[model samples]
Target: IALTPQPAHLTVKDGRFEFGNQLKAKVTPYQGDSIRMVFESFKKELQEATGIKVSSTQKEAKARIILDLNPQLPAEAYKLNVSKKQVRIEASRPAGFYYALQTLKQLMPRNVMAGVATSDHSQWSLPSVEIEDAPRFEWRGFMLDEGRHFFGKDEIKRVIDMMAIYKMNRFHWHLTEDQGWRIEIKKYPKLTETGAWRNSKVLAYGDVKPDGERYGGFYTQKDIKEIVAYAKKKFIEIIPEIDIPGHSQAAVAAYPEFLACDPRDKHEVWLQQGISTDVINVANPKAMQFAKEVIDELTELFPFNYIHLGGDECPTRKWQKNDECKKLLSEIGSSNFRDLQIYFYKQLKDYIATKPADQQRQLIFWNEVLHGNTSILGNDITIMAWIGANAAAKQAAKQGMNTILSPQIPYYINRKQSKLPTEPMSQGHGTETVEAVYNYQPLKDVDAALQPYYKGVQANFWTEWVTEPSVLEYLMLPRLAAVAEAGWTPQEKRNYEDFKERIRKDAELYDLKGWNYGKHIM
Candidate 1:
C-alpha cells in the first residue's frame, strides 16, 4: 500500500491473486522486444523472490500479464487492473507498460521485491486493485557527474536501472569537467589518454591535502554505445555534456594549442578544486573546430535529441591576461571577457544548428549562459538552473526561455543529508533532508501563466568526494525518491507525511538489493 509516487487514482477490490511457483503468464502475439523484455524481467524478478520460476506462454492462462496499445492514452500513461485471476496493463506506449510493471512490483509483498520468500515457501499474493497512473512532468531526470570521478559502464547501467524504477526519463551524463574528460573522442586521442587523468586530488576541502593517487578513467566508444543502448531499453535519454569555454581545463590540457592565450600553462587535468581559470579561447577558430569535432564524435555515440554544453562558472582571468582574447574582443566589438562569453555561446549555438542531428535537437546549458544578456539567446536553448537563487530560473522564464529546475540546495544529492557530525563529510553545500527535497515545487514563485516555460526537474549527484559506489548509492537514495515523487506527482496530490512513510517501505527493497541507502532522515 506504500507507493512512493502515489498513483493518480486507485480503488481496492475484494480478492487477491495467489501466485505460486507454477504460475503461468502469457503475452499477446507480436508484442515487440520491449514487452518481451518486460515479461522476462517479471519472470526473473519473481524467480529471484520466491525461488519459484514462473513460466511464459503464448496461449491464454489463468495467471497472465497482458499489454495492449491504446493511442487515446497519454504518453507514458497506463492503467492497471489486477483481479484474483490475472493482471492486465493498458498503455499507449511501451513506457507505460514498463511503468505498470514497476507499479505491480511495488504492489507485491516487500519481501518478494527484495527477492526473499516467505518462511514456509508458500505462494504469495498481491491485493486486487485498479489503478491509473502517469507522471505530471515529462522530464523527471538525474544528472551523474562522472567528470569528477569516472564510474564504469556497469555502474552507469546500475544508475539507469535506479532511474527506471522511479519512472525518471532523462540521464544527464556529465562526461567532461575541469578535473577529467570521461568520453572518448577518437579524433582527439589525447582527450582520453592525457585529459582523463590528474596527478593528484585533494582529500579535504579548506584543510586541503594532496593525495598522490593518480586518478583517471574514460569510456571508449564501445562503452558509450552499450550504455546508450542499455538506457534506451529503460526509456531513458542520455544527454552527453561537453562543458566548454569554461570548465574546459581537461580539453585544454588535451590540446594546449587550442588555448594559445597562455602558452606557458600546461592544459592538463587540474589538481585543485574550485573553478578553473584556463577557459577555452573562444575567439580562436581552431578552438571552435576542436569543439565541433568533439561534438561530432559524441553525436555519433549518443542519438539523444538534446546535448548539454556546460556554460557555468567560467572565470575570465586567463582570457583577460591573454593577448589573443584581447585582440579578438576588439575585433568583435566586445569590451570585456563577459561579452566574449556571450559571443562564444552565440557562436556555438549557431554552429550546433548546422549538424543534421542537431537541427531538431534542442541545446541545453547552465542558466549562467544568460549572464544578464537576456535578449541574446534564441528559443533553441534550454536553461538548466543549478544556482540555489530563484532569480536565475525566474529571469530565464520571464525572457521566454524553457528551463529545468535543478537548484544547488535540495536537488544536489552531493550535499550532506544531515548536519550530524557523525555523517560522512562531502564537498557539500550544506545539509538537505528528504522532506526538504520532497516538498520542493519547481514553479513555486513563477506566474501560473508562465508554467509552460518550466520543462521538468532534475537531481544532480556530483561525485567529488564520492570515490566508491557505496557512497554514491548512499547519497542518491531516499533523497532520489523524493526527487522522483516531486517531479512526477502533482503538488495537490502529494503529502509529506505520506511520502516519508512510503519511502521507508521502498527502502525495504533497497535493503534487499544491498543498496547503501541513507538512514539519516529516520
Candidate 2:
C-alpha cells in the first residue's frame, strides 16, 4: 500500500502473490527487439530487487506473471491485476510497462528495491491488488548541475535508475558552467584541455584564491552516446544544457580568440563561485559562429527534442563597454540593450530551425529570458519558472507557451535541509526542507484558463558545494520523491500526511541500497 506516486485507482484484494524461484514471466514479443529491450531492463530491475535470476518465456499458459501489449489502453497508462491465480500487466506503451513494474516492485517487501538479494526465498511476496495508473503531467523531470562538479557517467547511470523508479521522464542535464565545461566539442580541443580543469581555494573573506591543487573533469562524445542509449531504455529523455551570452566563462576560457567580450587580465576558467560578469559578446560574429558550431555538435549527440539554452543570471555591464555591442544595436532594430540577449537566442533558434525537420529542437530557458523583448522570441520556447515563485510561470502560461514550475524556495533541493551543524555545506541559507518541498502547488498563482499550458514540474540540484555523490543523494532524496508525487499524482489524491506514512517503505529500501538520505521527517 506504500505507493509513492499514488495511482489513480487501486484496491487491496483478499490475498497475496507468493513469487518464488518457480515464477516465470510470459512476455509477448513486439515487432523487433522492442519487447526484448524492455524485458532486459525489466529483468535487471527485478533481479536488483529480489537478488534472484528472473526467467521469461513465450508460452502464456504456464507463466506465473504475464506481460501483455494492449493497444487499446492510453499511452503511458497501465493496468495490473494481482490475484490468487496469476499476476497480469497490460500496457499500451513501453513507458506504461516500465511504470507498472515499478508499482509492482513497491508493493513487494521493503527490501525489494534495495539492489541486493536476500538469501531467504520465503520473503519474496507481494500484496494482491488491482491498480490502474498514469501520470498527471507529461514531463516529470529532475535536473542536476554536473557542470559545477562532474560526477561521471556511472554516477549519472545510478541517478537515471533511481529516476525511472519514480516515473520521472526528463533528465535536465546542466552540462556547461562558469567553473567547468563538462561536455566535449570536437572542434574546440582546448575546451577540455584547459577549460575542464581548474584550481581554487576560497578565503574566509570571500575572495578568490588560486590553490596549488587542481580539480575538474569532462565527458567525451562517446560517454554522451552511452548515457543517451541507457536513458532511452528506461524511457527518460536527456536535455543537455549549454548556456551562452552568460554563464559562458568556462566555454570562453578555452577559446578567448573568439568568445571573450573584451581583453582582460586573464582568460581562464572561473575559480570563484557564483555568477560571473564575463559573458561572451553576442554582437561578435565569431562568437555566434562558435555558438552555432557547439550547438551543431550538441544536436548530433543528444537526440531528445528539447535543449536547455541558459538565459539566467547574466549581467550586461561588460556588453555596454564593448564596441561590438554598440555597432550591432542599429542593425538588430532594438533600442534597448537587453534586446541583444533576445537577438542572440533568436539567431540560435533560427539556426536550429534550418536542420532536417526531425532534428529541429525546442528551446527551454530559465525565466530571465522573458526580461527582454519576448515578442521576437517566438511561441515555441519553454520556460523554467524559478526566479520569483510562480510569477514567471504565470506570465509564460498566459502567453500560450509551455511552462515548467520549479520554484527555488522549495524545489531547489541542494539548499541545506536544516541549520544543524551536522548538515553538509550547500547553496543558499538553510530553508528548503522536505515538508516545505511537499507543500508547494505547481499552479499556485496561475489563472484557470492558463492551466493547460502548464506542462509539468521539476526538482533541481545546483551543485555549487555538492562535490560528493553521497551528499547529493541525501539532499535530493525524500524531497525528490515528494516532487515526483507533485508531478504525477492528481491534486485531489495528494496529502502530506498520507505520503509521509507511505514513504516508510522507501526508507527501508533506501537503506538496502546503501543510500544516504535525510531522516528529518521519518
Candidate 3:
C-alpha cells in the first residue's frame, strides 16, 4: 500500500460522537437523540469555523469505554485508533477513552474555517508504538481544601467532572481543616450545624485571636451522597480526609471536649496560617469516638475503598504538655512525646478498620504517618509522598508498603502564577508555579517489590488563599493535564510542549462544559 501525503492538519469533526477506532471502542449506551443533536451541532460548528460540510453518526456498543483492568499496562504501548467515518475512538479503557477525546479536541484548530480535508489526503498511517503505562503511584489525586475556602455544591461537582475528564480518579477532599470544618456528622450535628456555618474573619493576613469572627461549612450526608454519585459516574473515587490531630481546631471549636488541651482556651481556624498546634485528644475517648463517628459518617457517604487520615505536619506542642498524652505515652513505652502521636494514630487506624463500612477499608496517610523511630502504623498503609519524594517513597517502599508521589516541589497549586493579588496564591510554606506544577515526576528508583505499592502521583491545591473558583481551575490546568497524562501515558511518550498544546485545546472544551477555568492556565 502506498502512503499519500498526510493532511497539513487534523481535528475533530464531531465532539459528541467520538469513539476510539480500536476494537475495544464499543461499550457505552447510545442516546441516539443526544447523539444526533450533538452531530448537528458539530456540523454547525464546523461550518461556522471552516465553511466545511461534515456528517456525523453515533456508534453503538455495550461498553462506552475500555480500560486495561490490570495495573501493569505498559504506558507507551498504548495507542488510539480513531476512525473518522466510524465516529469512534477506542482506547485501553474509560480513562483512555477520555484521553482520546482530549486528543481529538487538540487536533481541532482555533480556526475551523481554515481547516479542510483536501483530496490531497493520503491513506492514514499510524506509527506502531509502545506505552509503559502505569500511574507514578497508586494515589494520583486532587485535593479540594473545602475548609479554607468553602466551594458550593455545584462548584464541587464541576471540579469532580474536570478531574474525570483529565484521567484523574481520586479526589482527596480536605473536608476538615483548621480554617473550616466541612462534612456533616449526624452523631455530631454541631460539626456542621455549629461547625460549617460561620462569619468572616477579623483579619486577612495573619492569625487572628480566638475571638475572631467564626467561619465554617460542612456537607450533609445528603449533599455528600450526591457528590459521591456524581464522581462515581466519571469513574472517580472520592477519598475524604478528616485532617485531625492538627487541622481540627474548627472541629474543636465546634465541640470543645474534642480538644486535647485547654478546650476552655480560645481556639479558632486561621484564615491564613499553617499547622495549628491544637489537636483532638487522642487520649480522650470522647475525642477518639468523635473521630470515629466523623469517619463512619464519611465511609457511609463515600464508598471508595481508601480513606485519607491527613497524617501530615502535626506539631507535638500540645501532646508534649498534656497530662493525658503523657499517661498514654507511658503505657506505650514512649518517653518521646512524638511517639505518642504514632500510638494515637495506630489505635485510630485499628478502630477505623473495625467499622462495618470500613471492614476491608484501605488506609492512606500523609508522609508523616511513617516518620520517626516508632513503627506502629504498619506496612499496610499507603504513604502520600509530599515534601521530598525520594526519601519518603524509598523508605516506605523499602518497608513493603506502597506510596503515592505528590512532592510539593511541583504539585501544590497555592503558588501564584503571577504577582496580581487576584491570582492564585498560597499562605503556607509552598509556592509552586503553574509551569513548575506541569513538570512534576514521581520517584524514579522504586524497587520491583515496591512497584506494586506505587499507584500514581497527585497534585495538591491548598486553597489557603484561593478566593475564586476560577483561581482553582487556573492553578490546576496545564499542570493538571500534565499530571493526568503522566499517570495515564508511559513516561517515554511524555512531552511537555506537546502536552501544553493539548491543554490549550482542552481549555476550550472546558469552557463549553461551563467551567470557570482560569484565564492564565487555559
Candidate 4:
C-alpha cells in the first residue's frame, strides 16, 4: 500500500521558510505562515511541547505572530503535495490542518515531521506547521431508549466506547417509555416483575399497537452498577430516564390504581395508543404516590445529577372528558387540562427537591414541559428538546436553564434512511440518513452566546420496530461519531475528512474487541 506522505514542517529564516529537525528537508519558499498559525494549533505542536533544538539554523527568519487569532478557516478541506526535494500540505480548515499534521507525525520513523528514506535510514528537519478549522454547533449527543428494549451490560459498555471514539459524550439512556420498564424499583416489585415485560414484541416499521407476545426486559441492579462504572471509565455519563404521566402504560400496568380514572375493569397492557389515555392523574392521591415511589427508586439506583422525566406528545383530550379528571380540576379550581399536566409534573418533580443534597438529582423533561404554561415548569429544570424544535432549546436556554438539543427530524435514526428495508436506516418517523447523522451540529437554531446553557445534543432510538445489537450499531456508527466530535472537540477543530479517516482506522480496534459496527463508509 502506498502511504500518503505526512505534512512537512517549516521554520522562519531571513524572510524565507526553512525546514529542519529530524527530517531531510531542503529550503522551500512556503509563504502564508503567520496567518496559518492563527487557526492551526497542530502546526507547532511538537515545538511548543519541546523547544525545537536546531543546530543547522546558521540562518535567520522574520517572525511576525498573530496574537488575537480568530478561527476563520473553512472546516473541511485537506491536501498534501509532494515534490522531489520538498513536501507541503495545506488543510482546508485550521482543525483539519492540525489533524493532518498529527497524521504526518505517525508516518515518520522518529518523533519527527520528516525523515530521509533508505528503507529505514536516518532523518533531517522541518520546523513550522499550520491548520484552519471550526465546528457548526455546540451540543451533539445520542439517545438510546432502553426502556423499550433492554440491552445487556456489555452492550451499554460498547455503546460508551463507541461514543467516546466518535467524540459524543451525552448518552441519553431512556430508562422508561410506553413499551417496557428497564430499571429496578426496590419499593415497587411490579416495576420489574410485572411492569418490565410487555405483552408482545412489535414488528419493525408501520403501526405497532402492541400485540400480546409478553415482550420486554429489565436490568438487574448489578447490570446498572457495572454499566455506570464502565461509563465513567470511558468519560461518558449515562442519563437515566423515567417517563411519567404520558408513557406511563408500563407503570400503570403494574398498578391499576395509578391511573387517573380507575377503569371499571383493570387493563394492565396499554392497547392501541397510550399517550393520552394512560396518563396518570395527579388529581388522584394514589397515582401521585406511585410516581413519587418510582422516582425515588430511580434516584437511588442512578446517582446522576440529571434525571429525565419524559414529557412528549401527551394529549389532554381524554383527561378533559374523564369524570374523575373533571372533578379533580374543579376541586383544585384549575382552568384547563394543560395547566393540570404542568401541575402534575411539578407535583411529581417536587420530590426531586426533597432528595438529599448529596444525591444531586435534577429534573429534565421533553419540550412539552414548556409548551402549556411557564408557571408550572420551574426555571431550574433542564430541557431535552427532541422533536426537531431547535428553537425550543434556544428558548429554554434563554430562561437561565440548560438544554440538550435533539431535534427528531434530523437526528432520529430509528426512522428509515431511504425507504429501502435492506438499508441500515429504518423507515418510520423521518429519514435520518447516515450522512445526516454524521453531520449534526449541536446548536443549529440557538444563538451563539447561549452555548453554555447547551448541555448537549442526542440521537434518539425508540425501538418500536428493530431490537438487535446489529441494528444499534447500524444506527449509531458515523452519526454517533458526529455527535462525539460535536460534544468533545471544539468547533474550530472539526474536520469531516480527518474524522472519517480516524473512525475507519478505529473500526479495526472495534472489530478486534468483538464489536459489531454495523455498516459505514469504510
Return the TM-score for each candidate structure.
Answer: 0.92, 0.95, 0.76, 0.70
In terms of lDDT, the poorest run of 10 residues in model 3 is 1-10
Instruction: Show the lowest summed lDDT stretch of 10 residues, model 1.
Output: 372-381
Residues 1-522 of candidate 1: C-alpha lDDT, one tens digit per residue: 877678888899989976665666665444466666766776777777777667666666544666666678888899998888887888877788778878888887777656566564466777899999988888888999988887898888878877877889999999988889898888899989988888775433567766888888999999999999999877898999888878888888888876546867555677766787888887778888887777778778889888888889988887888777889888877675777777776777677777675443567889888783534456557889989536777777888888888988889987888777766757554458887888787777678877887888999998778778888888898898888888888888888898888887767677767778789655
lDDT agreement with native, every candidate: 0.79, 0.83, 0.61, 0.59
Superior by lDDT: candidate 3 or candidate 4: 3
User: Top TM-score: which candidate number?
Assistant: 2
Most lDDT-accurate candidate: 2
Model 3: per-residue lDDT, tens digit, 32-79? 333233234444544454344443223454433322223243321223
Clash counts for the predictions, in order: 1, 0, 43, 42
TM-score of candidate 2 on Cα atoms, chains taken together: 0.95
* Model 2 lDDT per residue over 1-522, tens place: 789888989998998887765578787687465755676776776777565565777777888889898999777899989987788999988788878888887887766655666765555777889998888888899999987778999889888877876889999999888888888899988888887888752211165355656788899999999999999888999999897778989888888776787766478888777689989889889889888888899889999999999898999888888889977877888778888898899999999999998789999999998989898788789999888848888889878889998888889999988777788888766678777888888876667899999989999989877788899888888888889999999888989999889876688777777777888877
Indicate the residue-level lDDT of 89 in model 2. 94
Error of 4 at 220 (Å): 2.1
Overlapping backbone residue pairs in candidate 3 total: 43
Where model 2 places Cα greater than 4 Å from the true spot, the runs are 48-60, 120-123, 201-210
